[PDB]
A paper describes a structure:
The CRL2 E3 ligase consists of a Cullin 2 (CUL2) scaffold in association with a catalytic RING-box protein (RBX1), with the substrate adaptors Elongin B (ELOB) and C (ELOC) at its N-terminal. When associated with the von Hippel–Lindau (VHL) tumour suppressor substrate receptor, the CRL2 complex is the primary regulator of the Hypoxia Inducible Factor 1-α (HIF-1α) transcription factor.
Using 3D classification, we were able to generate maps of three different structures: (a) a holocomplex map at 8.2 Å, (b) a map of the complex with little or no density for VHL at 8.0 Å, and (c) a map of the complex with little or no density for CSN5/CSN6/VHL at 6.5 Å. In each of our CSN–CRL2 structures, the clamping motion of CSN2 and CSN4 is a swinging rotation about hinges located close to the CSN2 and CSN4 winged helix domains. In the case of CSN4 the movement is coupled to the detachment of CSN4 from the Ins-2 loop of CSN6 by ~30 Å and leads to an ~12 Å shift in CSN5. Only minor conformational changes were found in the CSN1, CSN3, CSN7B or CSN8 subunits.
Residue numbers in the entry:
A (entry chain O): 328 to 654
B (entry chain A): 285 to 346
C (entry chain D): 1 to 348
D (entry chain B): 30 to 392
E (entry chain R): 19 to 108
Amino acid sequence: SNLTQENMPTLFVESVLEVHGKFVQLINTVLNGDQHFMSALDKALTSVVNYREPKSVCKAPELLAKYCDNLLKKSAKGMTENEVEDRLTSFITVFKYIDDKDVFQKFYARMLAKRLIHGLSMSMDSEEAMINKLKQACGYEFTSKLHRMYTDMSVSADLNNKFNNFIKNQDTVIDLGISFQIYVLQAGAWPLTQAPSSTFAIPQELEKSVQMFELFYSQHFSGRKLTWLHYLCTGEVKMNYLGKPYVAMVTTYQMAVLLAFNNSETVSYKELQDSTQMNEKELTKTIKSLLDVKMINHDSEKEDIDAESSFSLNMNFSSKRTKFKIT
Amino acid sequence: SPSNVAIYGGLCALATFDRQELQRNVISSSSFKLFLELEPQVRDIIFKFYESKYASCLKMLD
Amino acid sequence: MAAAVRQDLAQLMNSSGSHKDLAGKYRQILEKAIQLSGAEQLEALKAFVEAMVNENVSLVISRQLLTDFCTHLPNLPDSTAKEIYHFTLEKIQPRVISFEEQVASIRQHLASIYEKEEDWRNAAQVLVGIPLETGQKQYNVDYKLETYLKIARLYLEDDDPVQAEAYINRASLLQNESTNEQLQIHYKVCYARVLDYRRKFIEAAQRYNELSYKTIVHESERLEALKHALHCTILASAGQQRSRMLATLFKDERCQQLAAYGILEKMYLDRIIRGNQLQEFAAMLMPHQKATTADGSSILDRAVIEHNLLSASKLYNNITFEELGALLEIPAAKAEKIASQMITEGRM
Amino acid sequence: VDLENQYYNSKALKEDDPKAALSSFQKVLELEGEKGEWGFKALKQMIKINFKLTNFPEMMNRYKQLLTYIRSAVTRNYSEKSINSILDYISTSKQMDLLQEFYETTLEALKDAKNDRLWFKTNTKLGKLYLEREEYGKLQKILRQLHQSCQTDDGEDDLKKGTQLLEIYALEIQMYTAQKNNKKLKALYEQSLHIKSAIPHPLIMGVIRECGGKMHLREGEFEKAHTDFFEAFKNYDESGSPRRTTCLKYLVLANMLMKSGINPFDSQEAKPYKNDPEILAMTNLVSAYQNNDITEFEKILKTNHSNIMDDPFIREHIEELLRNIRTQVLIKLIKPYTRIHIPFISKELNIDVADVESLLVQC
Amino acid sequence: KKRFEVKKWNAVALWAWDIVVDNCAICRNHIMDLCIECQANQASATSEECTVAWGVCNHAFHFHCISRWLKTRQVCPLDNREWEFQKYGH
């Protein structure tokens, strides 16, 4: 109740370890580790995370999935093998108290699929040790969906090593930027399914490479139509207007907007609706994120988002490193 | 000797048990399978007694 | 004239400045290719397809140009538009995920050509490849309902009830949004006919009987559904489920209006079946209900023999194998195999 | 910086050379990228070339620099993908004369904080190579180090993939089955239960379950053999040929012995693979058992002979399956006929009268 | 204006045959997840990638659930329609 429902993902884990840690030693020393008092401590702790004072019962499995996203976040570099390995051991003990295992599985499925497509995977060992702790506690049936998602990413990793060797076999007008980022998805193992998007136009820079991926994937499976997901896939850009050529990994939705600036310095709202080739409901959320940053700046004194307002292009962008993640 | 326990137990149960009791005692039990595998001449007696092959099971007895 | 056409398309390939300026100059080039005739028309129209599949031209300009290009194609004769549809689908094949709206537009006109040339199997395979369920762009409800209705109609005329009733289930999901109650009745009637094609007259007699007691079914369709259930009960084999279905139709007063009251009365009272009773009932049966079943040329030739053996188990004391076959016009080798199968199944 | 390592690596990949391109990927390592994935991908391309030609002293020199950056310099996501890729590629081109020296030097550079998969996977391949060299001194030394922990696959509850005590026993099962020695297969199955109680669910777990189904099928327990063959077909499906086709014949054989085999395929691991003529031979065998017909069961053995007659395991049970079909047909024919003739059932079954008198006694 | 260049870029590889999976119709798991008869046996059934058994009505469920339903009634009396096997295997 000291934090009500605004609990932090790094503070909720330490709050449980401090309460349980001060009681796991008072019983094993004074009471000589009696089995009667040990069962009462685990039974009473299960009702704390399930029946609390604030009216926020669904926030317990959400904070548990958010804690794994911070340890697996890849901003630019990485982490050591001592603090991450020691924090994963104390995480399986807190999960034994929360009885809402069905809500945690739905939150972890959509979070793991987003960290792989966006490229936010920092340590591969954090994903292997996570599915192993859930199998030893819950069982092999509950961790069956998580094991299929990890094995599917390992198959695409082995395919990237074979496609990388093809560059040394007659290839000189292909090497330019980043290499393959194949993320094989399924219909039952993965939460994302083959659903119609919003008939995107696809920028002219992304016309190649992806075209060769459809013909390469058609050789392994006899007839397999693939659909792209522009909501989780991100690209990259190179700005040569500052003192250092910075690279910012932007979303593929912003690439179609920046491609329209090659004809004129400014692009109105009526011309941006035809270049993106989509509805106005999706362009509103896209132009909103570009206005808060230093990518698209307004003119005059104070210009809001309107149907007749223009949108200029700003060369100065807030950067500091190369290939920085925005999610 | 270990080559005589299969004959001592194989010939005693062949006279007191029928064909259905042999498939559940000297066949279903995995402990007696190791003793019958050493001497193949004793394992063929149980198989010939279950397939109603009394003609070939008698010639191998003498 | 085809030499100057390809030179004008390559100049505007990398040129980009406006949306209406690029689409305005490209429309004048495609207009001149339509007015051409002879061998110069085929070479000019094929150059426009290769100019749109490149990565230099924007997808917005290529989509707007391909939309109006598919409108003037049906105006051309079938001897010229046929070679264009087969050549355009091969160029956009590697980029089928980008121009999904243009692929279905070409396949919609290609299937109409095979329909006019009396080809039901060829026109049905064209609409199948259209990404209706595994596509990135969803069309309207009227566009999907018309496409699914043409596939089931072409497969039905080609003598294929399996492929015709397979694609009709996809259109049933969008039929709930409309208020057409007549289309929902035919959705379950057509499925009941496929179940009867597998020689399952016992199970089909219960589906047609339960559908006649509903309220959404029209009065003209409830009487026709009871006639199919009465015919399936006679064509079914003699057993325990046949006696329960014959007594249910006799208690209903709706069976008196049909002309098949004499067949139901002679089958419920365990009466005799002569050679003139099976011929009158076979004339009122559907053409898809008479198959080559050993003797005769109808399915009723087997149900009559099985029905006479069940009635003889409680009336005839003991008859020889030579006398039992002469009363049914069947050899002695057939009267023994049929009677032996009824005792094992527990029906005689 | 990360800008100089991008333009230099892009121009070096254009028309690579087996000797000239090695100098372009070496000067980029002295700049030390700040990402630092630009310097990690440059050394990965040099390993894929040194293992095909050149020699072995130059390959070990470039392999030590790859194992250095793995902590905070390079992300562990891109680093773990390179370790599992090179270890699976050098075991095919290089022979055993140069593969044993590459495993001893690797353990000296993996003594950091994370000592789970980096120590178990590197020590697993060492135990499999000692059996071919007939070395008893080095085999006992590596076994005492793994016995200090609780489990041989996981130190606590972290990374898996790395079992040596069960991999040695599993390699002897695949060899002893070809010699038909049931006295040794029974002793190896009891020793696999202690390791099974301390391992998760990798690939070796599905190998020890195959020997359990073969032992129970010989004693007469057809229900216990089906539970072990079905649990092993899921693990063998991930690997594939040739350890997947041979395991499918043992799964369908135990299903037809329970009276009867109405389920030819209970999983999708073998439904779309029936297009091959070798796998289709097992599909037609189950179809002849459901309808209960001895005329169609013998036709499969005559048509498919180079897949079912070459295995001595299924050949010893082909006689019992043919006798169980004759019993089901005799029941459906003896009910109507009260006093049926003896030659009557022999003509309908299209069999000689020599086996009819012997089958009527057992029935 | 800005520099745009890519070497070998790609998105995802999705696939869904026939219609989209709608959490089956007898439970809440996916078409390839452990339903009821798949997680309660853990011996004679599957445990990782479950099987997909299609039908004539273009609606797939589970092989362990459709086998026990057709044992006592081959037809479907819930709506008086055709029920048969079609297209084995995803």
